[PDB]
Amino acid sequence: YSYTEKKRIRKDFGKRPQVLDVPYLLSIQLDSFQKFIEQDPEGQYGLEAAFRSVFPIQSYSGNSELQYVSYRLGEPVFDVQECQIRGVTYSAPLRVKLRLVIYEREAPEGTVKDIKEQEVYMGEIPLMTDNGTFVINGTERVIVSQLHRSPGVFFDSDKGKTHSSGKVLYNARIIPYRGSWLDFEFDPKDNLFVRIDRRRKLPATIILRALNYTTEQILDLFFEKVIFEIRDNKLQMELVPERLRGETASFDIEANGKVYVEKGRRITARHIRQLEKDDVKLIEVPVEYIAGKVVAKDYIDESTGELICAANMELSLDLLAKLSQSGHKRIETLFTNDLDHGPYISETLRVDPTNDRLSALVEIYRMMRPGEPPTREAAESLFENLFFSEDRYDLSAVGRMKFNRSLLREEIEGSGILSKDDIIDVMKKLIDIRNGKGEVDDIDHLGNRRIRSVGEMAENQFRVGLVRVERAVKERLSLGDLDTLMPQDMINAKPISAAVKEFFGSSQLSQFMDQNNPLSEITHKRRISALGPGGLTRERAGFEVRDVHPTHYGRVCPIETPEGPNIGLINSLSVYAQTNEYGFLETPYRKVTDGVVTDEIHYLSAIEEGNYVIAQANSNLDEEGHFVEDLVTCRSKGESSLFSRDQVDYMDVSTQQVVSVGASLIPFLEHDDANRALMGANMQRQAVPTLRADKPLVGTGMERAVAVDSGVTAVAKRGGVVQYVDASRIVIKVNEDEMYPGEAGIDIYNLTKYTRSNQNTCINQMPCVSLGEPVERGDVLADGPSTDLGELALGQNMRVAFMPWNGYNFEDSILVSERVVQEDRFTTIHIQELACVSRDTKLGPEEITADIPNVGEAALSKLDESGIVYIGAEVTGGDILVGKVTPKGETQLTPEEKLLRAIFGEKASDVKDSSLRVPNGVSGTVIDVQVFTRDGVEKDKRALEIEEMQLKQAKKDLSEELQILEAGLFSRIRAVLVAGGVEAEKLDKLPRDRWLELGLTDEEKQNQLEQLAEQYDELKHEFEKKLEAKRRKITQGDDLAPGVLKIVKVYLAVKRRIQPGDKMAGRHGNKGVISKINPIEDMPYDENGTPVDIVLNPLGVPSRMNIGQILETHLGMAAKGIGDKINAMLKQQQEVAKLREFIQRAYDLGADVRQKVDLSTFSDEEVMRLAENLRKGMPIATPVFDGAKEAEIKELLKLGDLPTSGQIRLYDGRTGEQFERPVTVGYMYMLKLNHLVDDKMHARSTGSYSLVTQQPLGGKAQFGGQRFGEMEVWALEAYGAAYTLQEMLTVKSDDVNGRTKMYKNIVDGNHQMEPGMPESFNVLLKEIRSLGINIELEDE
Amino acid sequence: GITKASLATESFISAASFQETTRVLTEAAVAGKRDELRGLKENVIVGRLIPAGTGYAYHQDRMRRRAAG
Amino acid sequence: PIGDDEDSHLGDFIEDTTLELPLDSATTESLRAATHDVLAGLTAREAKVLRM
Amino acid sequence: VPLDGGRFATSDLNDLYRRVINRNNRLKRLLDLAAPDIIVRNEKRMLQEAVDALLDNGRRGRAITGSNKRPLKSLADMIKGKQGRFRQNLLGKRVDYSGRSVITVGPYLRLHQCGLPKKMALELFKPFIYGKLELRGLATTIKAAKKMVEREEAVVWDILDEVIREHPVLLNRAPTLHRLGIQAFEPVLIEGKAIQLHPLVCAAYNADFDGDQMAVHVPLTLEAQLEARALMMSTNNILSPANGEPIIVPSQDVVLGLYYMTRDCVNAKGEGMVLTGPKEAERLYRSGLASLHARVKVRITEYEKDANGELVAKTSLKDTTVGRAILWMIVPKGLPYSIVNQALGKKAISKMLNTCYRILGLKPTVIFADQIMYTGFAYAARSGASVGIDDMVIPEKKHEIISEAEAEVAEIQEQFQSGLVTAGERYNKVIDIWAAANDRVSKAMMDNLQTETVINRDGQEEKQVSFNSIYMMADSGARGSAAQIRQLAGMRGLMAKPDGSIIETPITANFREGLNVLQYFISTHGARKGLADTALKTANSGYLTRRLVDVA
Ligand SMILES: [Mg+2]
């Protein structure tokens, strides 16, 4: 077992033993970027390879070359945490050694001077956190792995809809990793066409001519030969018996004094066998048989010296008699069949406008760049630069591989550019497909689908940077002088900087990590997308690619995918899934040799898995693991059916290996329909953390692996005892077996405290260990938000009853008692970050000064001398968090205000109040205040206060570290001295610092003493720097935007319990909205008088089929039962015996479940604590498909003295009388979505408007009016409410006079409207009349 | 068909809503078309009382006063 | 175009500060009445001299 | 116009106009400089190009805006707008005096009213509140009134309760389809941020309580108020404009309640006895002396309006149940007692309302409906109806049917093995017999679920309809259907691969049982297919409606 597994244990039902445990869930994200940035000895993908691609860069013929030596990543400017505060990017400097060589003109190549410039900084690049996240501006962000069509050759069909004929079509497409696409396609006339990209269509052969192929050669490529012999007189023919197949005899087939075939007699296998064994190498044919046959090569008269017939031309009884008299004996003709071997290329030539290489190149250049005059150098350079350029083209490794593999080649690796043989082979294959041999692959198949990740894309971006800078290098090297410049003046910063900064900054893939929740983060980091650059779009792709493919098994989750605009264009990574070496997806399997199912794991990709017969995770094997039944359910090639006892090569690794980490957290999933299951696994990521993280009452067993593998918790790096435990920090003393010889050391984990998340929720760690407690290597030291003892708790369980309660639960709406809002269990904490901008206008600078025109003493009280709110001061909507004032000259009043100001003696201030007020309606406590001052502007009072405070706090925080670490080290030295030098009492007497001056007998112990000291001083000096830098980074003015003099960031912590209108659901996809909060008095109770927490609606259950939501209720009930029993025995303090007995009983449950429980545990100090944590309930694990069973749940119920029915009599808290029939009651885990009404509720009367078109628009976060759409208009039309409509689209919105002229009448008590004309139509009048169109309003 | 039948509307301002705007505007411009409203969409556009329901009376009285004494 | 890729183009977000909010013109309309009513109570030449 | 950070922003029309102007001037100059023909021509061409790009860009080389790749938006695009075809008056417009939030239940409501959040009503009627406030004199000037409600002084709540009384508000949901998508209600001030919506109207809006939000609008002008109250008023539309049938018909919980009342069992408390009026028939039940469902002859006075414009009266000893008898207390006037004597399913409960409308008129129907809702919820709650895992009963003969059909498949398998039947013939046979099995198990489970409750009155055995919860739900019309229950208890269907060809290995397990890896995976396709299908057919429906409103 383990350590923190002593504090609690989940009861694990199910039979199937885990053959392979769950790996690191964050695997992909980390591994990828781990490959991107790294020093790679070779051209394997990485910054190295990216460099080696475009480099070296030489001037155009100028013999001045710039090559690349090596690169390095300097230490980050700010650490992960500091950078999260300041708001900069967590990034490392890119320092690269470049070399500029100037070749002495007139080769041999040797250089006059090569200046090797030291590392030149181009840009900084983002870094990945241990949690697989990036921080762009003070915010954790994630780059979603992309899934797209892998580079290579692709043979499609496109039948049906095309041309309505039904003759179908066949198209091939060569798609590289970069560069133009090469398409080959047929048409109804069987003419082979080719196009680059999506461009103009061209007859296929025209590419071959550009490759230097004459007609003769093309015909030599795509057609066999039929040899004719004019021997004696009157032509004969060579014959291979297989040729005659698929045809009926055109004449008398006879030779060798024996007539094999007659006319009108089709040639079957019989005639073929006869002619075959008889060995007929020659047959005489009529002079008329060549009337249709097409000549292969050219032909000329030796005498006349004229062209008799061009290559690829139909022979006639005329031309034949023309070339036969010339002496020609042999004539070559294409071997053509309209069934077996199709004459497509021959007919392609007849559509070919071109003749030679040049003409082809011209017709191509006038295709790619149509309309501009074609040139030789142009048409050459283009065609060479398209598919043959090492620069502008590549398939990469995946591309070359899939290419050769789909061409049935041998070599899995080769060049990134096409070869003549490549293109020609692809054409040959397309032809073969049209001929009836060979199949067509499909895009949806996961074997044709690749998966990128952060690293690849980052590499692509940095690459684009390198090319856009390459142009600059070659540009400057044009006119450059000798030693005057260096590889600095050329290479800029921005080209790399903004290039990578763009990607991480704005991309549909790059996005703010969704952090409300551990499962949210972890399921965001494992996510795939067919969208973004390189992929398709929502409107682009249809349902096909969206749909779950059979290949998605063990790779993609069939359930958890977003439901909406993009469905199936995202999905999620399966639990055990891995990115293939090439970047396909591969899944764990169990190799079955002979008749035994072996526990040896194997990784098969989408293509690898294809022919193999795979058994099922749900199957029965006993002892040595032989399949019980002689017939076992298995899926083999694309399909699934019953297979013979031993026909199988493989079996499923686990029960959960089909689903995803999110879908694996749904208990009794096998009992839920896939729709509502999707809804559930989608909503579970929307769970907001709670104030008291509880625990799942009904589990799976992934709840540990999730919270653990995610960064929310803090795991121990090494095992040992805890020296110190604080809500702030945790200090572990490292065990000797683990700990390194030098420096000794004790692991110090600094815990994260209350701080803002990306979702404006609260993220706060808490210590789960006590002072001086033993820990295991890799154990949970401190939990996170919504995490309990290593297990993931996304919400809180509670007492649930199914019964209609006076309609208050009517729809999916939920009715909850007051016991829940009282205990503050469902309460959540929110952290809002508000900012105040001090800018500069031509009218004057803005002041943050506390001196504000027109404010009360109650407003001025909450602020200090500097105008900043005190830390810890609780505020509500309208309070002044930060004072601000902006200069406004010449108030420019009217006589009424002139008289008013004259009488009341009020000087109109030259300044307007710009202060940042608390958003209306929200109320919280100020936790933290930050001040960013422009470099060079004098720091204000509060600024200095904050600065010095941070200085002292940093001094204490670093000093404490130095102290703990040093005491720990000296202790280790003192430990070494007593071995070989021993004086125990006599040692610690003299000053500690003196201990260093001591020696010891000759031994390795004298060396360790050297080490301890050698490292001591390191930590001694490493203090200085760690202080100095830390000091300076507090002092330096943070860089700001143009015009902003300083910025005050205030952090507010609001606490919201729960109220009607909030949305909360279960993991089964049953939504709900709290309707009323009912008194405990009116709450239905049982015979024990215990009120029920929540009353749901039983009507929602049958229609939306999730029966799991009931099972979770039943089991949970029984589960809590086992809690109460223990809670009794603990309250009655029986003994360590009875408790052990009952606990052992509960951990067994009938027969045949893998458990492995106690009596190893210490009889008192251990067991008694386990029961102590179990008194709240008995946590139960129900694996996805391996989960619990009816009778098991019922038996556990019997163990809890609860009924089998799971239904207990209830009583109305009002009349007290019984409810007829029982009601299902129990415990259901309920989350709380972040959809709380406090955010959702909006309203407006008359707000600010828009400048362009006068329309309602929120300026102050005072929400602009609701949108009235065309349909919403049709409603009013149908009703026939005319004035409602008019005012709706005129006076309440678009009418610039109407709005105010209305408002006046509104206050005056007169309800009317003087509508006028909406500004939209007026604007349209001006817009139309701006053109040559005269549009007027007429009549009267 | 309904999609085809919707194509014919006397009011051009109405046509500029659903149909291709450019074409309609030009095609109506050359002919010097006169859009008299009388319909729903064309009226909603210009922000006047719907010639139906509560406003059918208004548009009626107006239509009657129009093209008369 | 800002996020959502829609017709939500940046210009549609520029608010009009230049035009006075209605809640103001209300108050001004009333201040007319305040000053007038209060100038009704002064003597003839006091009203004339103050208005002048 | 300006912007924060000192930066500017401007329309693309300025770039375009600038180009046109510049080139035009350059042409004038080149004219005065007597430039050669080639130049003046090139210039004229360029000007034509520019003017074109200004009027409509994209019939030409598609000019791009300054230091930006995106093509500048021309005047044609200024007119045409975008997002399909609308110019600002169709696709939408922002409107003052409006709001929105999540919606809640509010069963205490009357069909003519809705709970309106306090703060919301404050912000919405703010202009009116000002007016009333300084109308009574509680505020010196409008400014002071603003400061009053800004402070929320205790008097303004009552001042608001003044303006709220007869002033209706409009409520609306996201997918507006038919005119009932927007209705008028009477505001009732409520604490909290949620809007309370009358359950009976939840049908027309197609609003689940799963977190749907509803927009609110204020009928500013007087005409808008009278329009809302005499037309858009919820109480004035009780009938679907599509068909004469009532749209206000009780939905789920309520129909389950009335079902549980109007139901009758064989032997219970008070079975066989006799009581004068329903007034004491309620007393008997409330006391616990008599069960809600038992056959009891009781006197009732039922009215018939048969006389011309005039209500008749009569009475008789009717054979009915305690529950039905109690329910009769609601039914007004002219409706005959025969309407409540049935089982009262979701269908009949509607025809009750319909007949009430076509007989008694509007008001009696409205109040009738309110009452029906209240009693529905009440008695449904008292009923203690629930859903357990054992409430779903699987046929005992199931595994047997499965096994026999499973023998059929192997029979046809042997046939094809011996070549007795062709591949396709065999396939069709197997799929036929499997579907047959599915039908067997289904028509079994429905029987074992429906009448299987066997009980006794004074004798040994007499059998009637089941009291099983999920069955009451499916039978009444509250929720669920035989087709769905079929998926709960009996085996669920057969699934077809994405190709559209049905698999010959159906799902032999149901939801109450475990669905293994395969069965679930195979179900997934049908699931995503379903979600996609409906989500798309929503858009198709919308497009259809649009073409329709355009043609009419
Ligand atoms: Mg819904």
What whole-number distance in Å separates Cα of residue A458 and Cα of residue A499? 10
- D149: which residues sit within 8 A by CB, 6+ positions away? D122, D126, D129, D130, D133, D156
Distance (Å) from the C-alpha of residue A448 to the closest C-alpha of chain D?
A: 18
The answer to whether the CB of A693 falls within 8 A of the CB of A786 is yes
For residue C2, list chain A residues with Cβ-Cβ distance below 8 A: none
For residue D526, list chain A residues with Cβ-Cβ distance below 8 A: 674
CATH number at B2-68: 1.10.150.390
Q: Which of D80, D231, D550 shows the shortest C-beta gap to B22?
A: D80
Looking at the structure, give the CATH architecture of the domain made up of residues D389-537.
Answer: Orthogonal Bundle (1.10)
CB-based contact A1254 C19, cutoff 8 Å = yes
DSSP H helical ranges for D294-397 = 322-327, 348-360, 362-383
> ∠ CA(D121), CA(D124), CA(D125), 5° rounding?
85
Is A1328 part of a structural domain of the chain?
Answer: yes
Q: After which residues do gaps appear in chain A, with C to N over 2.5 Å?
A: none
* Centre of ligand 1 from the C-alpha of residue A694, in Å: 29
Same domain, A1259 and A1336: yes
Which residues from A are below 8 Å from B when comparing CB atoms? 1273, 1277, 1279-1283, 1285-1286, 1289-1290, 1294-1295, 1315, 1317-1318, 1320-1321, 1328, 1333, 1338-1339
In chain D, % helix, strand, coil (3-state, to 5) comes to 50, 10, 40
The residue among D443, D449, D446, D414 whose CA lies nearest residue D429 is: D414
What whole-number distance in Å separates Cα of residue A1140 and Cα of residue A1171? 9
DSSP H helical ranges for A311-419 = 317-324, 344-351, 357-368, 376-387, 396-406
CB-based contact D470 A804, cutoff 8 Å = no
Chains D and B are in contact, defined as 3 or more C-beta pairs closer than 8 angstroms:
yes
* Centre of ligand 1 from the C-alpha of residue A523, in Å: 25
Of all residues in chain A, the one with the smallest CA distance to D232 is A1279
Same domain, A1270 and A1332: yes
Is A1077 part of a structural domain of the chain?
Answer: yes
Chains near D with 3+ CB pairs less than 8 A apart are A, B, C
* Distances A935 to A930, A1027, A1050 between C-alpha atoms, Å: 15, 22, 21
Tokens of A926: 């100020």
C41 interfacial to chain D (CB closer than 8 Å): no
DSSP H helical ranges for A101-254 = 205-210, 215-222
Q: Which of B13, B23, B50 to mutate to test the interface with A (most CBs of A within 10 A)?
A: B50
What whole-number distance in Å separates Cα of residue A50 and Cα of residue A470? 12
Of all residues in chain C, the one with the smallest CA distance to D128 is C23
The answer to whether the CB of A680 falls within 8 A of the CB of A1233 is no
Tokens of A1226: 């129990």
* Distances A988 to A402, A970, A984, A995 between C-alpha atoms, Å: 71, 11, 7, 9
Tokens of A760: 């404006």
Q: How far is CA D515 from the centre of its chain?
A: 31
C19 interfacial to chain D (CB closer than 8 Å): no
The radius of gyration of chain C from alpha carbons, rounded to an integer in Å, stands at 22
The residue among A1177, A1124, A1158, A1228 whose CA lies nearest residue A5 is: A1158
End position of a domain, from candidates A400, A417, A442: A442
The residue among A1244, A1065, B52, A757 whose CA lies nearest residue D96 is: A1244
**Touching A: D residues 489-548, CB under 8 Å:** 497-498, 505, 511-512, 514-518, 520-532, 535, 545
> ∠ CA(A281), CA(A283), CA(A284), 5° rounding?
150
What whole-number distance in Å separates Cα of residue D530 and Cα of residue D522? 13
What whole-number distance in Å separates Cα of residue A272 and Cα of residue A279? 10
B64 interfacial to chain A (CB closer than 8 Å): no
CB-based contact D11 C11, cutoff 8 Å = yes
If you ran DSSP here, which 8-state letter would residue A687 be given?
A: B
B54 interfacial to chain A (CB closer than 8 Å): yes
For residue C10, list chain D residues with Cβ-Cβ distance below 8 A: 9
HSE of C21, CA atoms in CB hemisphere, 13 A:
15
The answer to whether the CB of D471 falls within 8 A of the CB of D445 is no
Q: Containing domain of residue A1051, as a range?
A: 827-937+1038-1056
End position of a domain, from candidates A1037, A1070, A1101: A1037
CB-based contact D94 A807, cutoff 8 Å = no
Mutual angle of helices A518-525 and A702-709, in 10-degree steps: 80
The residue among A1249, B14, A525 whose CA lies nearest residue D549 is: B14
* Distances A64 to A104, A474, A481, A722, D483 between C-alpha atoms, Å: 9, 9, 10, 64, 81
Q: Which of A1268, A1272, A1276, A1286 to mutate to test the interface with B (most CBs of B within 10 A)?
A: A1286
Distance (Å) from the C-alpha of residue B9 to the closest C-alpha of chain A?
A: 18
For residue D80, list chain B residues with Cβ-Cβ distance below 8 A: 21-22
CB-based contact D548 B2, cutoff 8 Å = yes
Q: Is the dihedral of CA A941, A944, A950, A956 positive or negative?
A: negative
> ∠ CA(A1301), CA(A1306), CA(A1310), 5° rounding?
100
Largest CA distance in chain A: 138
C14 interfacial to chain D (CB closer than 8 Å): yes
Question: Which residues pair with residue A748 across a beta bridge?
Answer: A731
Ramachandran sector of residue A88 (left: φ over 0; alpha: ψ -120 to 50; beta: rest): beta
What whole-number distance in Å separates Cα of residue A55 and Cα of residue A467? 9
Distance (Å) from the C-alpha of residue A1022 to the closest C-alpha of chain D?
A: 42
Of all residues in chain D, the one with the smallest CA distance to C33 is D141
Q: Which of C12, C13, C15 to mutate to test the interface with A (most CBs of A within 10 A)?
A: C15
Same domain, A127 and A57: yes
* Distances D100 to A1060, D119, D211 between C-alpha atoms, Å: 15, 12, 12
The answer to whether the CB of A657 falls within 8 A of the CB of A602 is no
CB-based contact D93 A1246, cutoff 8 Å = no
Tokens of A336: 């053509």
Q: Which of D9, D81, D143 shows the shortest C-beta gap to C11?
A: D9
> What does the DSSP assignment read for A747-772?
-EEEPP-SEE-TTSBEE--EE-S-TT
Mutual angle of helices A357-368 and A376-387, in 10-degree steps: 70
* Distances A1324 to A98, A1317, B36, D247 between C-alpha atoms, Å: 60, 12, 18, 42
Same domain, A432 and A514: no
A1049-1075 burial string, b = 16+ CB within 10 Å, else e?
A: bbbbbbebbbbbbbbbbbbbbbbbbbb
What whole-number distance in Å separates Cα of residue D185 and Cα of residue C14? 36
What whole-number distance in Å separates Cα of residue A1057 and Cα of residue A1041? 39
End position of a domain, from candidates A1240, A1269, A1290: A1240
HSE of A797, CA atoms in CB hemisphere, 13 A:
26
Of chain B, the end-to-end C-alpha distance in Å amounts to 41
Same domain, A1087 and A1186: yes
Q: Which of D74, D82, D89 to mutate to test the interface with B (most CBs of B within 10 A)?
A: D89
Q: How far is CA A14 from the centre of its chain?
A: 32
- Helix or strand holding residue D551 (H, E): helix D517-551
What whole-number distance in Å separates Cα of residue A679 and Cα of residue A1106? 11
Is A258 part of a structural domain of the chain?
Answer: yes
Distance (Å) from the C-alpha of residue C22 to the closest C-alpha of chain A?
A: 5
What whole-number distance in Å separates Cα of residue A1199 and Cα of residue A1194? 9
What whole-number distance in Å separates Cα of residue A908 and Cα of residue A886? 14
C24 interfacial to chain D (CB closer than 8 Å): no
Which residues from A are below 8 Å from C when comparing CB atoms? 894-897, 899-900, 1246, 1248-1254, 1257, 1259, 1296, 1299-1300, 1303-1304, 1307
User: What total number of domains does chain A contain?
Assistant: 9
Size of chain D in residues: 552
Q: How many CB atoms lie within 10 A of CB D366?
A: 21
* Centre of ligand 1 from the C-alpha of residue A812, in Å: 9
Amino acid, single-letter form, for residue A1102:
P
Amino acid, single-letter form, for residue A1288:
M
* Long-range contacts at D504-509 (CB < 8 A, ≥ 24 apart): D504/D409, D504/D427, D504/D430, D504/D431, D504/D434, D505/A640, D505/A641, D506/D434, D506/D435, D506/D437, D506/D438, D508/D402
Same domain, A1197 and A1158: yes
Chains near A with 3+ CB pairs less than 8 A apart are B, C, D
Report the CATH number at residue A584: 2.30.150.10
A1102-1117 burial string, b = 16+ CB within 10 Å, else e?
A: bebbbbbbbbbbbbbb
Same domain, A930 and A961: no
For residue A1294, list chain B residues with Cβ-Cβ distance below 8 A: 47
The residue among D384, D376, D388, D391 whose CA lies nearest residue D477 is: D376
HSE of A1225, CA atoms in CB hemisphere, 13 A:
26
* Centre of ligand 1 from the C-alpha of residue D105, in Å: 15
What whole-number distance in Å separates Cα of residue A443 and Cα of residue A173? 12
The residue among A1052, A1040, A1050, A1051 whose CA lies nearest residue A838 is: A1040
Q: How deeply is A113 buried, as exposed, middle or buried, from its count of CB atoms within 10 A (0-12, 13-18, 19+)?
A: exposed
C23 interfacial to chain A (CB closer than 8 Å): yes
Tokens of A827: 């309460």
Same domain, A541 and A629: no
- Helix or strand holding residue A522 (H, E): helix A518-525
Q: Is the dihedral of CA A1020, A1021, A1025, A1031 positive or negative?
A: positive
How many interface pairs between C and D have CB atoms less than 8 angstroms apart?
Answer: 22
Is A18 part of a structural domain of the chain?
Answer: no
* Distances A787 to A8, A705, A731, A757 between C-alpha atoms, Å: 14, 11, 21, 16
Same domain, A762 and A877: no
Q: How deeply is A1034 buried, as exposed, middle or buried, from its count of CB atoms within 10 A (0-12, 13-18, 19+)?
A: middle
What whole-number distance in Å separates Cα of residue A531 and Cα of residue A565? 12
The answer to whether the CB of A308 falls within 8 A of the CB of A323 is yes
A1156-1175 burial string, b = 16+ CB within 10 Å, else e?
A: eebeebeeeeebbebbebbb
Tokens of A285: 């044919």
The residue among A1278, A1280, A1118 whose CA lies nearest residue A1208 is: A1118
Of all residues in chain B, the one with the smallest CA distance to A1333 is B29
DSSP H helical ranges for A1181-1263 = 1190-1199, 1237-1240
For residue A672, list chain D residues with Cβ-Cβ distance below 8 A: 511
CB-based contact B21 D550, cutoff 8 Å = no
Distance (Å) from the C-alpha of residue D101 to the closest C-alpha of chain C?
A: 22
Q: Which of B5, B16, B44 shows the shortest C-beta gap to D551?
A: B5
What whole-number distance in Å separates Cα of residue A612 and Cα of residue A602? 12
